[PDB]
Amino acid sequence: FLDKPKTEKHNAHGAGNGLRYGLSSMQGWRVEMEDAHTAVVGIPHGLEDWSFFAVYDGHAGSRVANYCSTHLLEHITTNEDFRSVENVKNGIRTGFLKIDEYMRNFSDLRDRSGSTAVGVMISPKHIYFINCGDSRAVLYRNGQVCFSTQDHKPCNPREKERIQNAGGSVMIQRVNGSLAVSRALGDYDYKCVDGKGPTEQLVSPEPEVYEILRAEEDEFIILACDGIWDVMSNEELCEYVKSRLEVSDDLENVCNWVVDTCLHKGSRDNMSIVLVCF
Ligand SMILES: [Mg+2]
């Protein structure tokens, strides 16, 4: 932690495919910035009617977060499982596994970094929520929270079971008393258990994928990391954003307001939020 937070924001925004987005990231109280993001409206080479947005919360360095931000989408869309809902979901799963294996082979990783990843792939008919770690995506529809991804915490029943089966333990709500997420990309020190596949390791790169039919009543999706969700609940943040959209249509601005509000509520983390309005 710094003595004084770096409150400078990086912002971006864009529009297309019947969406508008804004985003904001801030280093905040932490000594390093290790978050990254992806915002693609109109996926090229065939997926022009689709969009993808993601937030990556890095730890023990930026290297994994940064690489995901510019390569995960490629890994998802170009594998043989991706190339129907079934196939999209498998393609996403395959992309996560292949990037985790690929990154492992870089000279610096053979660097101890890891990253969460949360995203949405938006098609003309479906939203695919994607989660790996304790970042979170939430959908607001018809004036209510409609959907939330499930945070991957070591204390969760099935996460604890896998961890125990891999010879670890959950102590102080952390993997072997150190890692505060039970799923992530990178973190290779937690993926060296003999006799276990990639998805059976102390920390798993397997994402959970939730597909949701799109509705005319869809209002917005929020993607943010635990530095936001730590101080605001799903309903609390949705209602906040809703109240801000009442006075501003500048999504960068709205996102900056969210981030500053969470800082004032005491969040000492790096923070990244992406707001996608329909
Ligand atoms: Mg964080």
Whole-angstrom CA distances from 194 to 166, 176, 190, 228, 267 are 9, 17, 11, 36, 38
| Contact indicator for 252, 213 with CB cutoff of 8 Å | no
Instruction: Count other Cβ atoms within 10 Å, centred on residue 218.
Output: 21
Amino acid identity, position 223: L
Distance CA 228, CA 234 (A): 10
Q: How far is the CA of 59 from the centre of ligand 1 (A)?
A: 8
Token digits of residue 278: 């329909």
CATH topology of domain 1-278: Phosphatase 2c; domain 1 (3.60.40)
With b for 16 or more beta-carbon neighbours within 10 A and e for fewer, the 234-254 pattern comes to beebbbbbeebbeeeeebbbb
Give me the residue spans of the domains in the chain. Answer: 1-278
Resolution in A: 1.8
The radius of gyration computed from the CA coordinates of the chain, to the nearest angstrom, equals 18
Q: How far is the CA of 22 from the centre of ligand 1 (A)?
A: 19
DSSP codes, the chain: --SS-EEEEEEEEEEETTEEEEEEEEEETSSS--EEEEEEEEETTTEEEEEEEEEEEEES-SHHHHHHHHHHHHHHHTSTTT--HHHHHHHHHHHHHHHHHHHHTSTTT----EE-EEEEEE-SSEEEEEEESS-EEEEEETTEEEEE-----TTSHHHHHHHHHTT--EETTEETTTBS-SB-EE-GGGS--TT--GGGSSSB-PPEEEEEE--TTEEEEEEE-HHHHTTS-HHHHHHHHHHHHTT---HHHHHHHHHHHHHHTT--S-EEEEEEE-
Q: How far is the CA of 57 from the centre of ligand 1 (A)?
A: 5
